[PDB]
C-alpha cells in the first residue's frame, strides 16, 4: 500500500432508485466520498496511475537554499579586519522552503546540510591568490560566538566543524532531529514570558510568536589562510534537504507576501487576486 | 434520528433538535496521558467533573455590518471557575475541548456561518514598522474575544504604539486565503439547515503537556460566509459554549497574577 495502483473504476449501469449519492450536507463537515461510478454510467477500466510522487517524503526531496553568507580575505597592507561571518540557523528567511514547510503546523525531519562555495576577486589583479581553505564551525546555543578571525574559540574543542578546500565537491553533513520538543513548531501562538502585576513593564515583555530566541544554533565560517596581498571575496550558499520527514497538521498555504519572521503582512500589498468576470470562460 | 443530539458533560447537558452530526477533529477523541508518552514525573491532577462542564462565553451580536469574531482557547476560559483557577495554579496542563456554537434563526432568515478550529491561530499585528510586537494584554482578550476587520490600517503614532492585532477577514488574520480555511476542522451553520454546530477538539501540540498561560493551542474563528439578511439591519445572537474534556494538570505552584489592567 505504498506505490501500488489506485482503485479501479467499476462499471455502473443506469439506475432508478431511492439511493441518492448526489445529495450531501457540507454543514456536517464531511466531504461526500463519491466515485464517478456513483453518478455517471462508467465503463470498467484498470487504473495504472499511482500516488508515489505525491508522498510527503517525495514532496520534500528537493533541497532548497536558505542563506547566502559573505566572507573575505582582506589585503595585508589595509587596516580593516578580515570579515568572518556568523549566521543564526533558520529556514524563515527564504520564501520557497518557508512556504513549503508552512503547509503543516508541526514537523520532524532529519536535516542534510550542503555547502557550495564560490570565490571571486574584487580588485585590479596585482598578484593572484592560492587555493583557499574554509572552516565551517557549528556553534550550538550558549557556546561562545567568535569575536575575531583568530579567536581562541576556533580551536574546535567540542564544536563540530567542516574544513572545505576550494575546487572539491561541495561538503555535505547530516544532523538528526535536534529539536527539544517531540516535533518542530513552525507556528507558536504564545509568548516566552508572562507579564505579572508585581514585575515592572520593562522586565515582563516578550515577543509574540517567537517560541525561542536561539532555536538550532549558529554557523560560523572563516577563511583559514593568512592575509593575501590582494583581496579575495567569497560567498557560501547553504542548502537544506529534509530527510525522513513526518508532518502533522495541515494548513492553508500563505497567499500574501511575507514580512519578517512572524505571520504579519505589509501594507498595500494585500491584493492576491486579479480581475476577471463571473460569466467569462 | 440524526438531527437530534444530547451532549452530557459533568452537571451540564446540552440538547439540540436541529444538529448536524458532530465532528471529531482529526479522527481522535480526547484522552488522558498514556504512560508511554508522559514526560513529567509528578502525579497529575485529573479534576474531571469539576472542570469538564459547559461554560458559555459572551454572546456576540450578528448584524449586516458584522465581519466576524475569533477566540483563543484555553484563554477564553481563564475567568470560568475551577478550570480557570487550575490554569492559574498549575504550571503544566492539557485538555481537549468540545466547542458548541448556537445560532437560532427563523425559516425566513438566511445566512451562513463558518465555524473553524485552527491549531496555533497566530494573527498579524497592526505595526507595519515592527513585527511581532503585540502585547500579552491585547493578544489574550479573554471571553469577549476579538473582531476581524475588513481593511488594514496601521497605527501611525510610533510615540505610543497600540500593539494590537489587525486581522483582515478574507486573509483569515494570518495571510492565508479564506477559501482554503476549510482544510481545518470545521462545520457550517446554515440557517436553513442547522441551528448549531459541534466540534470535539483533541489536544494537539508538539509537546505532551504545555504551559496553558503562555501558549494557546486552538483558535476558534466564526466568519460569516453568506451575510445575514431578512425582510426589513436585523440582529441575531450567537452563543459559544466550550467544555474541557480529559483535563489534566501538573506542577502545582503559587498563583500567577497576569497583568491585564
Amino acid at each position: 500500500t505504498s506505490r501500488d495502483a489506485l482503485p479501479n473504476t467499476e462499471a455502473s449501469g443506469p439506475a432508478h432508485s431511492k439511493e441518492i449519492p448526489a445529495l450531501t450536507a457540507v454543514e456536517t463537515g464531511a466531504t461526500n466520498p463519491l466515485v464517478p461510478s456513483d453518478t455517471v454510467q462508467t465503463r470498467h477500466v484498470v487504473q495504472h496511475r499511482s500516488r508515489s510522487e505525491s508522498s510527503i517524503e517525495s514532496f520534500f526531496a528537493r533541497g532548497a537554499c536558505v542563506a547566502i553568507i559573505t566572507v573575505d580575505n582582506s589585503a595585508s597592507t589595509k587596516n580593516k579586519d578580515k570579515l568572518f561571518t556568523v549566521w543564526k540557523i533558520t529556514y524563515k528567511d527564504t520564501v520557497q522552503l518557508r512556504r513549503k514547510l508552512e503547509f503543516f503546523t508541526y514537523s520532524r525531519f532529519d536535516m542534510e546540510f550542503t555547502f557550495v562555495v564560490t570565490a571571486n576577486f574584487t580588485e585590479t589583479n596585482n598578484g593572484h591568490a592560492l587555493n583557499q581553505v574554509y572552516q565551517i564551525m557549528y556553534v550550538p546555543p550558549g557556546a561562545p560566538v567568535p569575536e575575531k578571525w583568530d579567536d581562541y574559540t576556533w580551536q574546535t574543542s567540542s564544536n563540530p566543524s567542516i574544513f572545505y578546500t576550494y575546487g572539491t565537491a561541495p561538503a555535505r553533513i547530516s544532523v538528526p532531529y535536534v529539536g527539544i520538543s517531540n516535533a518542530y513548531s513552525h507556528f507558536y501562538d504564545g509568548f516566552s514570558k508572562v507579564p505579572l502585576k508585581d514585575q515592572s513593564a520593562a522586565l515582563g515583555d516578550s515577543l509574540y510568536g517567537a517560541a525561542s530566541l536561539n532555536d538550532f544554533g549558529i554557523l560560523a565560517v572563516r577563511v583559514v589562510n593568512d592575509h593575501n596581498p590582494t583581496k579575495v571575496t567569497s560567498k557560501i550558499r547553504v542548502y537544506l534537504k529534509p530527510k525522513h520527514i513526518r508532518v502533522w497538521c495541515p494548513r492553508p498555504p500563505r497567499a500574501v507576501a511575507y514580512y519578517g519572521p512572524g505571520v504579519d503582512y505589509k501594507d498595500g500589498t494585500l491584493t492576491p487576486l486579479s480581475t476577471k468576470d463571473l460569466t467569462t470562460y | 434520528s440524526d438531527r437530534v443530539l444530547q451532549l452530557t458533560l459533568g452537571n451540564s447537558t446540552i440538547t439540540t433538535q436541529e444538529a448536524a452530526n458532530s465532528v471529531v477533529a482529526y479522527g481522535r477523541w480526547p484522552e488522558y496521558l498514556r504512560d508511554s508518552e508522559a514526560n513529567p514525573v509528578d502525579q497529575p491532577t485529573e479534576p474531571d467533573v469539576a472542570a469538564c462542564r459547559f461554560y458559555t462565553l459572551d454572546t456576540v451580536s450578528w448584524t449586516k455590518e458584522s465581519r466576524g469574531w475569533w477566540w483563543k482557547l484555553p484563554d477564553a476560559l481563564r475567568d470560568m471557575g475551577l478550570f480557570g483557577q487550575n490554569m492559574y495554579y498549575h504550571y503544566l496542563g492539557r485538555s481537549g475541548y468540545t466547542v458548541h456554537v448556537q445560532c437560532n434563526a427563523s425559516k425566513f432568515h438566511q445566512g451562513a456561518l463558518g465555524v473553524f478550529a485552527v491549531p496555533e491561530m497566530c494573527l498579524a499585528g497592526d505595526s507595519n514598522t515592527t513585527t511581532m510586537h503585540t502585547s500579552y494584554q491585547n493578544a489574550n482578550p479573554g471571553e469577549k474575544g476579538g473582531t476581524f476587520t475588513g481593511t488594514f490600517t496601521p497605527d501611525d503614532n510610533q510615540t505610543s504604539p497600540a500593539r494590537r492585532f489587525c486581522p483582515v477577514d478574507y486573509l483569515f488574520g494570518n495571510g492565508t486565503l479564506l477559501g482554503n480555511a476549510f482544510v481545518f476542522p470545521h462545520q457550517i451553520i446554515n440557517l436553513r439547515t442547522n441551528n448549531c454546530a459541534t466540534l470535539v477538539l483533541p489536544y494537539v501540540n508538539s509537546l505532551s503537556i504545555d504551559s496553558m498561560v503562555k501558549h494557546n493551542n486552538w483558535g476558534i474563528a466564526i466568519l460569516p460566509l453568506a451575510p445575514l439578511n431578512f425582510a426589513s439591519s436585523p440582529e441575531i445572537p450567537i452563543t459559544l459554549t466550550i467544555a474541557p474534556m480529559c483535563c489534566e494538570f501538573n506542577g502545582l505552584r503559587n498563583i500567577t497574577l497576569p497583568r491585564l489592567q
Partner: antibody, heavy 124, light 109 residues
Framework: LVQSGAELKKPGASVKFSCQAS????????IHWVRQAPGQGLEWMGM????????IYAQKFQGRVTMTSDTSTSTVYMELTSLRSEDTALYYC??????????????????????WGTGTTVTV | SALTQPASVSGSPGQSITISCTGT?????????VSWYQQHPGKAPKLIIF???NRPSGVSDRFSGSKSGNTASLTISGLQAEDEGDYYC??????????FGGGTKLTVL
C-alpha cells in the same frame, strides 16, 4: 574622507544639505545622516543607498525630509522642507563601511557607521 | 523611543566602571547589532565596540562589553583621564529603523 557642505541660518523656510564622498565608498556603501542638537545626543535621520537609490526615513523626520543622489559628482543631497526652532542643530553625514559578522536577514551584510564628516551647524 | 542610559557616571582613575544601555524587547533583546560610540567634546564620534563584544583596531583593551536580556553594558576597567567624554549606545529596531541612546557623560575625578 568625506566633505560636508555649507552652514546656513535662514528661519522657517527650507534648507538644503550637501555631502560629497569618494567614488568607491559612494558606489559600494550606504550613507547615513545624524542630527546632533547641543547636549541632546545623537538622533538618526535616514539612509541613502546610491548602489540602489533606495531611501529610508525616520518616523520623526518623514513629513519634512527628502534625500537625493548625484552619481556624476559622487554626492548626495538632503533637503529639510520645513524647519522649526528646535531644528537648530549640528548635522552629520556618515558613511557606513564597518561590516558586522552577523548575517542580516539571511542574504545581506550589516554595516555600522565608521567614517564621519566634519558636519554643518544650521540655525533657524 | 530612544534607548535608556544613565545621565552621568563619576569615578576616580584606576577604577573599573560600567555604563549600561537598556532597551525594549526589540533592539538589544533580539538583534545582536548593538554598538557603542565615543565622542570627545567638539570632536566627531568614533566607534569603540562594533559587534556586542568586539573591538576595532586602535581601541585599547580596557574597554569591554556584554549583553544580558534587554540590556547591554559597556565596562571600562582601569579608567584613565583620556577616557572622559560622551558615550552613546546604538542598535537596530526590528524592521529597518535605527535608534540611538540618550548618552552618558563620564567624569574622571
Amino acid at each position: 574622507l568625506v566633505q560636508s557642505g555649507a552652514e546656513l541660518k535662514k528661519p522657517g523656510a527650507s534648507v538644503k544639505f550637501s555631502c560629497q564622498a569618494s567614488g568607491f565608498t559612494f558606489t559600494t556603501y550606504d550613507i547615513h545622516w545624524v542630527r546632533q542638537a547641543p547636549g541632546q545626543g545623537l538622533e538618526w535621520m535616514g539612509m541613502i543607498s546610491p548602489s540602489r537609490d533606495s531611501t529610508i526615513y525616520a518616523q520623526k523626520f518623514q513629513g519634512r525630509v527628502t534625500m537625493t543622489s548625484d552619481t556624476s559628482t559622487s554626492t548626495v543631497y538632503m533637503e529639510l522642507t520645513s524647519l522649526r526652532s528646535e531644528d537648530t542643530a549640528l548635522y552629520y553625514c556618515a558613511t557606513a563601511s564597518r561590516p558586522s559578522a552577523w548575517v542580516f536577514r539571511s542574504l545581506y551584510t550589516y554595516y555600522y557607521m565608521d567614517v564621519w564628516g566634519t558636519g554643518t551647524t544650521v540655525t533657524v | 523611543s530612544a534607548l535608556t542610559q544613565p545621565a552621568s557616571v563619576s569615578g576616580s582613575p584606576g577604577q573599573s566602571i560600567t555604563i549600561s544601555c537598556t532597551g525594549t524587547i526589540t533592539d538589544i533583546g533580539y538583534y545582536n547589532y548593538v554598538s557603542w560610540y565615543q565622542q570627545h567634546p567638539g570632536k566627531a564620534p568614533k566607534l569603540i565596540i562594533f559587534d556586542v563584544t568586539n573591538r576595532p583596531s586602535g581601541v585599547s583593551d580596557r574597554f569591554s562589553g556584554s549583553k544580558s536580556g534587554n540590556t547591554a553594558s559597556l565596562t571600562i576597567s582601569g579608567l584613565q583621564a583620556e577616557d572622559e567624554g560622551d558615550y552613546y549606545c546604538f542598535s537596530h529596531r526590528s524592521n529597518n529603523i535605527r535608534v540611538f541612546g540618550g548618552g552618558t557623560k563620564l567624569t574622571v575625578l
